[PDB]
Symmetry: C3
Subunit: 331 residues, 3 copies
């Protein structure tokens, strides 16, 4: 039947250099989501019989600092879908995440233990869900396990009289074998953000990616490459390596490094980001975390560690550092 | 006690001719609510004793396509009321539907099996609830069953220093006898939509209606007439509907509505017909398929109500709407 | 585990003189919250063991008249916090009420049986919660009972590159001894309401207060003084006395009177407000109430009984009276 769930993440974050309305740059202290975005949701599954089940998920994301909605402000701004699931496959209709989150995000640190501040610059590949990365009016298929091989795709309508006014589609697959995990996916959007009725909330946007991860005992490591492109021209490539080791069953330590190269009108911009996180689990539901991330950029641009808000100003320097200590609770 | 409930309706809908910002008109494909508006809510009843019970309903409507609120965007945009219920009657305070939804809507196809696209042109009679048809700041009384005879009324404040800035009131009754069901109601609004504090969310508006329905076995039929008036435009709606249950799990429905309107002394005509097939996978989950056709007079255009009044008209006098969808209850 | 709760308050209210867009003033009849603001929420507490428990509260306020959010419109506009609680103290992070609501509000009639219309003029001391009195990005500590002595403090971040751009902090204490209860608190805000990222949702604001209350049998009485100050210049002092007598265990009668003296640019304004309330409890969850409030001001200003909305226009005269009859239900 119906199940209520949620995760609450509240912590204090210090950012070293955030630009001011005046030309200067000052340190920013904030109370908000550190790793995961605070959310609450409803999920259910009704056994219709004959191997068929009706399924639904309604998930709403909010900021525990101010209590407001994020991801645009709708009711169920993260996920809202219903569909039928069989042993053949699952088809779901509604506001959902595309294949890049289904198959690429599990390989990245921002999609696992790292969360927000371990995201790639400006979340250009849309890997982290502490942002409006879901697409509206989406039809999604997810295949069966097929011996660890799972593939799926999504197609998103614009709900406007113009077909390509806000269309999006994606496809991906992943294979898991013991500790080894491999995945790849692709997503495309057409005129993303034009109208309110379309898939991408307010040219041609594309994301490519492939990566792998291995987990032997307490040690888990992974490497991933992603590319985000915008045409009709900006292009960016992200190269990430991440490692998490569980010293204690309750204590895990994670390190990640990302190099980002971007082509904005044919000239190169570079980002190098490194971050460390220690998380201690007080229980299955509650844990405490602490993390520090460092990013320095090339001299032709500035540094910005993604803090969940794209509107946050860049650093005045090529230097920015972010440190967070927080509490995370599930129910 | 308190109960969480909800209905999820997701389907793909095709409209034949929806106008574009440019003069041309194009077909529109959308993923959203086909029959019923997706909603979730909390309902409760506490037995206070002595035949008295406290009741409340908080109901929020949203679109599963984008996850956003409808009906203006408030939290509980469909219904939000509390009140006391006794064997004499029930009084409730809050954002509620008027008598036309209480007594006329059960007779219409748009209020039963048809839903959104089976509504009369532009939902002029306010029969369909896939829109902002509730009224704010409403006092409502509903009588006892009295041998199948139930009557009720509503009174709605403006919550502004001008009383008639957004006043509304309604009254209606319905009688049910074996297969026969009969109902009639009246609703009036004064300066509807003027201020944000008033009953109708952003002259003198009135709605009339009376109809009847009969249900023998798998065959259920009904016919209804409604009239909507605007003062300080006039429209009459004539509807006939039938639903037959081929299989206990499979139902077929057909409906036809003719609408005649007098706007500044000029007559406008609409004829709307629709067919729907629904199969019940369970008590909670079903799948449906439907097709609707509407033709207008050449002095105007056709528009099948799709739940959004801002949706542009057809460029032609012809419009067609087709939907296939999934509906789940929890 | 997690618990869903809520309060529904619906009543009809009559105000004698509310200003109109045209110079005239007309009587206003409204359907809305009489005493308490309608709300729903989720609360939970997980026993982490060893005397430590994780706790959270997510509370949303709405108006049953229109179904809309109040207190700015966010999801959890009243309270949204998570924290850890031990026998030493409790620390919580998120959108919370400051010390003035923790320790001063219980002494006032507006914070107990009176509610909205028993609030001081313009709710200047922020004692009533039928308004946006919570502060964002707040770290709060609440001490143990210490033999009826409870003290606490709050600190609220600006979440902007400027530290004091929308900063707030508060501190307070309360002592309870049999029937007698005494409390005092202090709150300060810097540039309240400037930016969206700060503590107070859209100069220098401070509130002081101290009071005491006694309850012997069915007779309950209290007296309280508060001062609210605004610079960059207004200052106001409120003197309140309140009495509640329970004729029947289910029937209570309440009377309250407040005198307010204000300094606006060096000129004095006077308010005298009197109100009476009778409430009959149909059960522990359901009760019915009736109340009438009268306020008179000096001729250099106007009268306005706080109706939960600060934007409500004043009376055209120095005279205003407010009467409400309503139903209040808990779940």
């Amino acid at each position: 039947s119906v199940t209520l769930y949620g995760v609450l993440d509240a912590g204090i974050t210090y950012q070293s250099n955030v630009a001011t309305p005046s030309g200067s740059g000052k340190s920013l202290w904030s109370v908000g989501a550190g790793v995961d975005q605070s959310r609450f949701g409803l999920r259910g599954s009704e056994d219709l019989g004959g191997g068929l089940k009706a399924i639904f998920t309604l998930e709403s994301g909010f900021n525990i600092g101010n209590g407001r909605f994020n991801n645009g402000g709708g009711m169920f701004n993260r996920q809202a879908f219903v569909g039928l699931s069989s042993n053949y496959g699952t088809v779901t209709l509604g506001r959902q995440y595309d294949a890049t989150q289904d198959y690429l995000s599990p390989l990245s640190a921002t999609g696992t233990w790292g969360g927000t501040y371990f995201a790639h610059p400006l979340n250009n590949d849309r890997l982290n869900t502490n942002g409006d990365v879901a697409v509206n009016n989406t039809v999604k298929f997810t295949s069966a396990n097929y011996a660890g091989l799972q593939f799926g795709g999504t197609y998103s309508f614009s709900n406007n009289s113009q077909f390509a006014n806000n269309r999006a589609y994606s496809a991906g697959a992943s294979y898991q074998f013991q500790g080894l995990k491999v995945g790849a996916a692709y997503s495309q959007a057409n005129n993303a953000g034009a109208n309110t009725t379309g898939a991408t909330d307010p040219g041609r946007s594309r994301v490519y990616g492939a990566g792998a991860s291995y987990a032997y005992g307490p040690l888990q490591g992974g490497l991933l490459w992603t590319q985000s492109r915008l045409d009709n021209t900006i292009r960016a490539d992200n190269y990430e390596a991440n490692v998490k080791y569980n010293l204690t069953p309750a204590l895990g330590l994670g390190v990640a490094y990302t190099y980002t190269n971007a082509k904005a009108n044919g000239e190169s911009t570079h980002w190098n980001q490194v971050g460390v996180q220690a998380d201690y689990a007080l229980s299955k539901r509650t844990d405490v975390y602490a993390q520090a991330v460092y990013q320095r950029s090339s001299k032709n641009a500035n540094a910005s560690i993604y803090n969940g808000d794209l509107s946050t100003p860049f650093s005045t320097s090529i230097n920015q550092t972010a440190a967070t200590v927080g509490l995370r609770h599930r129910f």
